[PDB]
Design a protein around this ligand. Structure first.
Ligand SMILES: CNc1nc(Nc2cn(C)nc2C)c(C(N)=O)nc1-c1cncc2c1ncn2C
Length: 285
């Protein structure tokens, strides 16, 4: 039994608003019995949403589990709002972190990319394209563990239509074959997004972020679009530059899979562990 017809406040104390976007509004909350901290996400239900589809979406969240994806605990449906209870990730998103710390070290980025690649390899095996890989959608808990905030864009939830169309105002992390579809693309779009995210963690913004989103969207559709590169050449190793070159392969017919990317020297160098992130969180305190 799940998706209870009741106020989540009956079981949880709402402490503070953590943030939100097209995916919903997120709150810090505390289990009234055990005292454990959770994140409660509120998503408004649209008139064309149906609970038969909703039940199928929640079943995917319950069954599909991986160490690099934020765990689902349970859900509520109250006054046309779907409330999702999930694992609390105390440090917030990588964007919340780098806005305070500044750029991540190459080693710290290598660790984050290895963890995200593991989460992506899992989703792609379950035939799920994430389509929303970016620093704001990668969370860090108090143990320095890396978690994808969600499985990516929901295929059949009403509120997620705005998320599916969000690339119009924010196309910077999107693969060119996605922008230039207006025939097709596949799961390798998430590998390009990870490449852009790796530049974002290094430079505090994705490539061309200051260019109007509508101009970027059009530039990606044009023939001759050159994949971005790291700006400061002398700051990064040949292995990091090569990792960017490989993930940002323009043709998806030449771009490696999430599993293959795990064989890259950057993400298989020695000393990659959560201790690198605990050290990043030490700058915060
Ligand atoms: C605002 N989003 C989030 N915040 C969170 N916590 C947080 C944020 N801050 C600043 N500090 C804390 C402690 C947490 C969490 N699980 O702890 N989950 C999200 C979140 C949830 N679902 C989808 C998401 C999310 N994030 C992006 N997508 C696409």
């Amino acid at each position: 039994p799940d998706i209870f017809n009741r106020d989540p406040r009956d079981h949880y104390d709402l402490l503070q608003r953590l943030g939100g976007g097209t995916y919903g509004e997120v709150f810090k909350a505390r289990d009234k019995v055990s005292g454990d901290l959770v994140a409660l996400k509120m998503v408004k239900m649209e008139p064309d949403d149906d609970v038969s589809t909703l039940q199928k979406e929640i079943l995917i969240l319950k069954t599909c589990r991986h160490a690099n994806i934020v765990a689902y605990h349970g859900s509520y449906l109250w006054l046309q709002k779907l409330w999702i209870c999930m694992e609390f990730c105390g440090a917030g998103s990588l964007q919340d972190i780098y806005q305070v710390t500044g750029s991540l070290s190459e080693l710290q980025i290598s660790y984050v990319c290895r963890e995200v690649l593991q989460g992506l390899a899992y989703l792609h095996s379950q035939k799920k394209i994430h389509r929303d890989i970016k620093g704001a959608n990668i969370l860090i808990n108090d143990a320095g563990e890396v978690r994808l905030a969600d499985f990516g864009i929901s295929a059949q939830i009403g509120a997620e239509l705005a998320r599916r169309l969000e690339f119009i105002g924010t196309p910077y992390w999107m693969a060119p074959e996605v922008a230039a579809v207006a025939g097709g693309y596949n799961e390798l779009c998430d590998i390009w997004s990870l490449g852009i995210t790796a530049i974002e963690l290094a430079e505090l913004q994705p490539p061309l972020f200051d260019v109007h989103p509508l101009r970027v969207l059009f530039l990606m559709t044009k023939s001759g679009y050159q994949p971005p590169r790291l700006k400061e050449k002398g700051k990064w190793s040949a292995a990091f530059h090569n990792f960017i070159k490989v993930t940002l392969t323009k043709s998806p017919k030449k771009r490696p899979s999430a599993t293959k990317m795990l064989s890259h020297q950057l993400v298989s160098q020695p000393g990659l562990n959560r201790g690198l992130i605990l050290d990043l969180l030490d700058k915060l305190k």
